[PDB]
């Protein structure tokens, strides 16, 4: 009858109507209760979105923060597989985090990882930029297969490259096309710092 | 009724009420015309969004096909740019596209596009990656940008680290181009070294 009480319910009625079907309304129903007693705890559905996607990455973005002794690119290649892999637990998981910034929760791992970047020789800005591409992408790359899945449900003689590429595609859920995308990502910031120096 | 007639007013309607509220329903009410009627055009949401994917483009991403001569560098930095523009057209018009597939009007353009790329000694499957890389990142970049502005009325907090409080200042000086442009220029990059890379 809580904060923490509203997102665990909030979780599963996302994977069951998703984040479309998730209202004020309907949550206050699965838990019956009034709409304005939520909002001593979630106020809209803007903080409850923050909110769970907040809990989405405490629970299932399994790595963070880099290990001892180890590379940028293992640490960007670690973080945007995590990432991925946490916002394909839940329905909807990319949309919840579309225009999110980190809570007072996660900001001492934001600031270690902008520390670190600026440790191996990049600048505060192409730090960031470098993660804020790998986020990108990671959120486009999820969003495009959970929402092509989702439109299946509906949706009902090739040229040949064309048919290669749909049977690349259809290969798997888009794992190896992200993986190729985020190592051209990290060879590129690569090269960029590089060419600085 | 006749398409163009169905696809202004849905384009309308969209900047109206933004894709959750778009509906057949009331596509049908602003079109004058009963639910059957515009069903035999449009079938559903779904059928209404993919038609409205393919317009977007079709009027608004400007660029497609490279120039006799052009680099696939160049290429790929200028779809993406285009393919940005067209997106950013219409509201919410990056989640009009997701989930999509190229349409059959559109498979001619995808496969000059993919042979253009084998081609340059890009391989299908690197080609199709790096292209769809590029579109995935582009998205992801617009649909962070059309949704963090969207919230900004729902105080710096006073707790905030100092370089997270600087890169935060970072990321509100622009629309979001500054860091978009990077991003797509480091793909480039990437995809430079890995074609070099085999193609030595
Ligand atoms: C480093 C940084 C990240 C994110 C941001 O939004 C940032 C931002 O808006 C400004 C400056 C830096 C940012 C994320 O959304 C991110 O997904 C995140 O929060 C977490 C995380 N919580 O573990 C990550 O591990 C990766 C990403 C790091
Ligand atoms: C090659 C390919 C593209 C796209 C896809 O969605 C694909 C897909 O979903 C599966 C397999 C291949 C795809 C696009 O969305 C794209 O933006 C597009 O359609 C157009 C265009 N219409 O001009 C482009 O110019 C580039 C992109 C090509
Ligand atoms: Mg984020
Ligand atoms: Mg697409």
């Given at each position: 009858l809580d904060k923490s009480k509203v997102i665990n319910s909030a979780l599963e009625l996302l994977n069951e109507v998703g984040i479309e079907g998730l209202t004020t309304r309907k949550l206050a129903q699965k838990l019956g209760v009034e709409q304005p007693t939520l909002y001593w705890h979630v106020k809209n559905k803007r903080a409850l979105l923050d909110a769970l996607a907040v809990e989405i990455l405490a629970r299932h973005?399994?790595?963070?923060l880099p290990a001892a002794g180890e590379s940028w690119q293992s640490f960007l290649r670690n973080n945007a597989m995590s990432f991925r892999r946490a916002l394909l637990r839940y329905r909807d998981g990319a949309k919840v985090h579309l225009g999110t910034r980190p809570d007072e929760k996660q900001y001492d791992t934001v600031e270690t990882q902008l520390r670190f970047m600026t440790e191996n020789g990049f600048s505060l800005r192409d730090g960031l930029y470098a993660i804020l591409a790998v986020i990108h992408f990671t959120l486009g790359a999820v969003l495009e297969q959970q929402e092509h899945t989702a439109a299946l449900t509906d949706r009902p003689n090739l040229p040949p490259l064309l048919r290669e590429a749909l049977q690349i595609m259809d290969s798997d859920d888009g794992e190896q096309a992200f993986l190729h995308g985020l190592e051209s990502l990290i060879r590129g910031f690569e090269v960029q710092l590089t060419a600085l120096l």
């Open positions: 973005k399994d790595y963070s």
